[PDB]
Design a protein around this ligand. Structure first.
Ligand SMILES: NC(=O)c1ccc[n+]([C@@H]2O[C@H](COP(=O)([O-])OP(=O)(O)OC[C@H]3O[C@@H](n4cnc5c(N)ncnc54)[C@H](OP(=O)(O)O)[C@@H]3O)[C@@H](O)[C@H]2O)c1
Ligand SMILES: NC(=O)c1ccc[n+]([C@@H]2O[C@H](COP(=O)([O-])OP(=O)(O)OC[C@H]3O[C@@H](n4cnc5c(N)ncnc54)[C@H](OP(=O)(O)O)[C@@H]3O)[C@@H](O)[C@H]2O)c1
Ligand SMILES: C[C@]12CC[C@H](O)C[C@@H]1CC[C@@H]1[C@@H]2CC[C@]2(C)[C@@H](O)CC[C@@H]12
Ligand SMILES: C[C@]12CC[C@H](O)C[C@@H]1CC[C@@H]1[C@@H]2CC[C@]2(C)[C@@H](O)CC[C@@H]12
Lengths: 278, 272
């Protein structure tokens, strides 16, 4: 008799603020299963939720580790109500560095948590939404999944890959009744070391990582959003009668980006994004 | 003297054909190390390079598992000249089916061959190119890395993944004189027991659509190779080459709607 929601990576940041945002809706429509890597880290979730007056039964925490099929099947099992209406695939990592200085196991993890991670869930959860003929899936995007970023090559790869996977299903889902959707965030707040690092790369590349580092601090300062501003927008896409494939949490990158799309050779983008950075 | 090319997945298709367009151009300027997962698979390379009067030492073969970096290191040790000039990352895999029908070692395996493999090669060969301040890297792309495709959810995942990997590198290398490019190709010439029955229906509906698509639009590897050569003789190269014009209306449409839902509505009808 409620909207049943299930969110990955709810110990901090966007998962968190979406979990509490939704459990405390004054509609009291949402039954929210907030899942977490490691439940030992569930304190902040529940300090926030208490704080927010979430009526009880309105929020539950479950364990779930995206790297693991079992955990995913095991949280599936603990849904009580027997259905999901919203499923939000939110857990994710970054990776930052000169490609060359990047460890092949860090590259593996980023890929598992961010792409394959989102595969397992949709594997475990889409069947039944397809069956019912109902469901909204909401998918934490990144401006890094819309245009390439120097020193985030592997991170960008995992972002573009989910835009990839999601667009592909959204094509297919459209007459099933399932409505998959990407929420696209620039920097959000409540956000290795150089020793090692000159060692694994050349001095011009190292100099430019520094420029890179200095310019993305300025961008954080200027342009990071509260997680609350951001979870507001996941609400909207789930309120929507006809959901679109993408929501933007901001228009700020909306020009460096039409620049990408007004030129498919990509030479305008690569000049413009390089000036803007370096 | 000669431009040293090193090609991945030379046992057939694109790689095979480019290896032998290069070793055998009337210029005589290319020297081509054509790498293959295993050599047991080479007779056709060699037959094809024989079909073509490739001069000796215009073409050595190597083995290169792109999933294994030691073998990336092994094939690197074997450029005699001590420099690669052109690098082609071509070795690729498909994976078609209903997303839930998919094996976890297959998903993993498509991403480790297509994305991680390409990463291991750039990590092995771009250092030396940056230090010199020159080099071309050409990456074989797809139109499935440009837009999303029913029942190739996971395959487009890894092609989109090399787009953003190669775009990010592109921004860094601009001022090194090191030039990376993507040749975006359209087509080039159990299940039930995993998946429901209206999914399993229209994964026919979908294959009927590609069949008549390949037939109106397929391109041979010799036509593709010519984009590869067009891109590597360019003075001032772009990040993307399009082996064809068929798909750029769907793509301007995908572009013209950031929002996403036109493209999805175009593409759904198109195929269903
Ligand atoms: N932070 C920003 O500046 C920003 C900007 C744009 C977009 N975003 C996007 O939002 C998402 C999350 O970023 P956020 O920090 O704002 O929120 P978030 O909810 O904290 O998401 C990151 C989360 O991933 C989870 N996670 C890590 N490994 C996991 C695993 N193996 N299995 C399951 N979950 C795992 C972590 O907590 P658990 O213990 O819960 O699992 C963590 O909460 C990403 O997909 C990202 O694209 C963030
Ligand atoms: N076929 C089409 O219709 C088409 C259309 C558009 C774009 N393309 C693109 O072109 C590329 C190749 O397709 P193709 O069949 O036309 O040419 P291709 O040169 O045959 O590339 C596929 C190759 O990948 C190699 N490979 C597989 N696993 C590998 C591994 N572990 N390590 C190294 N290499 C491995 C295979 O031979 P090895 O033994 O040599 O390694 C095989 O030759 C892809 O990246 C794809 O996007 C093809
Ligand atoms: C990487 C960040 C932050 C984390 C979030 O995942 C994505 C955004 C994308 C926009 C980035 C910003 C960092 C700095 C960049 C590169 C600016 O120079 C222009 C675009 C900015
Ligand atoms: C997967 C393929 C083939 C291998 C090549 O490397 C990439 C292309 C992309 C174009 C595909 C084609 C298969 C059929 C598709 C999916 C049709 O639905 C419309 C466009 C076609």
């Amino acid at each position: 008799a409620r909207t049943v929601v299930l969110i990955t990576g709810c110990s901090s940041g966007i998962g968190l603020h979406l979990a509490v945002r939704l459990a405390s809706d004054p509609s009291q429509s949402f039954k929210v299963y907030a899942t977490l890597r490691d439940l030992k880290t569930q304190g902040r979730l529940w300090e926030a939720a208490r704080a927010l007056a979430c009526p009880p039964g309105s929020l539950e925490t479950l364990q779930l580790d995206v790297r693991d099929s079992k955990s995913v099947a095991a949280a599936r099992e603990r849904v009580t109500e027997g259905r999901v209406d919203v499923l939000v695939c939110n857990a994710g990592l970054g990776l930052l560095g000169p490609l060359e200085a990047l460890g092949e196991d860090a590259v593996a993890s980023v890929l598992d948590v961010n792409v394959v991670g989102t595969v397992r869930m949709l594997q475990a959860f889409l069947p039944d939404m397809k069956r019912r003929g109902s469901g909204r899936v909401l998918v934490t995007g990144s401006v890094g999944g819309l245009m390439g970023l120097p020193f985030n090559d592997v991170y960008c790869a995992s972002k573009f890959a989910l835009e990839g996977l999601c667009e592909s299903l959204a094509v297919l889902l459209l007459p099933f009744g399932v409505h998959l959707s990407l929420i696209e965030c620039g920097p959000v707040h409540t956000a290795g070391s150089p020793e090692e690092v000159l060692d694994r790369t050349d001095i011009h590349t190292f100099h430019r990582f520094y420029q890179y580092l200095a310019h993305s601090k300025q961008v954080f300062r200027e342009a990071a959003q509260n997680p609350e501003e951001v979870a507001e927008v996941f609400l909207t896409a789930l309120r929507a009668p006809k959901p679109t494939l993408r929501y933007f949490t901001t228009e700020r990158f909306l020009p460096l980006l039409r620049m990408r799309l007004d030129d498919p050779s990509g030479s305008n983008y690569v000049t413009a994004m390089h000036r803007e950075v370096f």
